[PDB]
Amino acid sequence: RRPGEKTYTQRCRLFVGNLPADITEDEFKRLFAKYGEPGEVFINKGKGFGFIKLESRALAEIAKAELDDTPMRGRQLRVRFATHAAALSVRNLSPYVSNELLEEAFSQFGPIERAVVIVDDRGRSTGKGIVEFASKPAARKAFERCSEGVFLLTTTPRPVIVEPLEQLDDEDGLPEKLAQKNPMYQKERETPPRFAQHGTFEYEYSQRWKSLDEMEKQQREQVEKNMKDAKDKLESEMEDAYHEHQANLL
Amino acid sequence: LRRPGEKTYTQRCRLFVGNLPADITEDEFKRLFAKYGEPGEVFINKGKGFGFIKLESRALAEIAKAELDDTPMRGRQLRVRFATHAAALSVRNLSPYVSNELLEEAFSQFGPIERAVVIVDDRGRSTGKGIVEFASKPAARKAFERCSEGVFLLTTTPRPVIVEPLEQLDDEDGLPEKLAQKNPMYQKERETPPRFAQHGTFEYEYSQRWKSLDEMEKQQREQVEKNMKDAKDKLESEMEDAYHEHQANLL
Ligand SMILES: [Mg+2]
Ligand SMILES: [Mg+2]
Ligand SMILES: [Mg+2]
Ligand SMILES: [Mg+2]
Ligand SMILES: [Mg+2]
Secondary structure, three states: OOOOOOOOOHHHEEEEEOOOOOOOHHHHHHHOHHHOOOOOEEEEOOOOEEEEEOOOHHHHHHHHHHHOOOEEOOEEOEEEEOOOOOEEEEEOOOOOOOHHHHHHHHHEOEOEEEEEEEEOOOOOEEEEEEEEEOOHHHHHHHHHHHHHOOEEOOOOOOOOEEEEOOOOEOOOOOOHHHHOOOHHHHHHHHOOOEEOOOOOHHHHHHHHHHHHHHHHHHHHHHHHHHHHHHHHHHHHHHHHHOHHHHOOOO | OOOOOOOOOOHHHEEEEEOOOOOOOHHHHHHHOHHHOOOOOEEEEHHHOEEEEEOOOHHHHHHHHHHHOOOEEOOEEOEEEEOOOOOEEEEEOOOOOOOHHHHHHHHHOOOOEEEEEEEEOOOOOEEEEEEEEEOOHHHHHHHHHHHHHOOEEOOOOOOOOEEEEOOOOEOOOOOOOOOOOOOHHHHHHHOOOOEEOOOOOHHHHHHHHHHHHHHHHHHHHHHHHHHHHHHHHHHHHHHHHHHHOOOOOOO
């Protein structure tokens, strides 16, 4: 199932639209009793969507795999993982913080479902991660306490920067269905995809845009280096003020 | 869970499996996935207890994953994950009218496309960044190459499309403590547990000084966003000038 629990958490919350108009609290359940003893359930039968919690991420995965785009009284089904409600980004992490540590530190704010540290295709800490709370109230606190205060995790004072999680969708995307529903759209369609030939407006334009784009890049990278350099110096600055005062008392 | 005539045995369908016993053979492997239908392609480092198999379908591979990951097998628990796409690009500067379908249409031109998607926010509005997945790497190089060489346009509006290699991040496995390298620089960061620093201490002053450098950095970068935006709108009307009246001579 899932050893050492993390049962019936928001990561086991699935969503389902395109419910036919004749649906009960009970028929829903009957649809997902294959995958065991359900948790919190919600339906707005009016608007033909519903939510369900399963015991485990795995069950939720299988359910989803099994019940997506399958019929129920004419209607094909929309199974999706539900977007977590109590989720923060964290940044400025010591390369030496672990998923475990980050979870540990954050529990001081209320029960945690999960906490992860985002890693590169080389598995190196990217310096960001996610913290996922059970409830929202805990996430409120976290985000407040940490904006108001200075939360540190390791010896070297790296202050945690905590933001609300921005949630992107890269699975559904922008389907044609929804696209067409726009005026500018049909105009934008009229001229197909293409490489633009030297000689045309399109050309001299985009070559120039490209340049502006390249510039912006350098500009941005330049800023990052400045402020990088600033940040390293500030180390070498404060030292004097304080560290030296601890070599005077000693 | 399926759609007749949906291109099958894609990279979206490739599973990696670690922690196989060193006494594994091809034929043990294919039967572990016996229940998930007709096995596609297989590779195995028998010396390194790891391997890959393609299945028919995303939905299958999901279930296989959910089912087998962490399952015991002659001593070890298997690690089973989705294999990291090898033929994948980031694309940016999308008119928010471009769609998954289009993006696919547009890039097929380079080679067969496993999948093309536009990344949409919570409001379902395009963010102008999107992903393109090819069957093969050639397809992805050729598509990067032309597109850095040339200028590639999608729509009547000449928004030129930028292509990068797709930077692949892990938010699943993450960085477990086990994996944290118990080098010196390790326990020595841990010597001091989590805490809020107190007003007056060094930890504090440093950290608030840092914070300010941080928010500065922010603003400065938003500023560059602002600068260039304007330059880009100036360029727009500029060009509309140098030409629409060449178009007025063509009227
Ligand atoms: Mg009831
Ligand atoms: Mg009830
Ligand atoms: Mg505890
Ligand atoms: Mg930075
Ligand atoms: Mg420890």
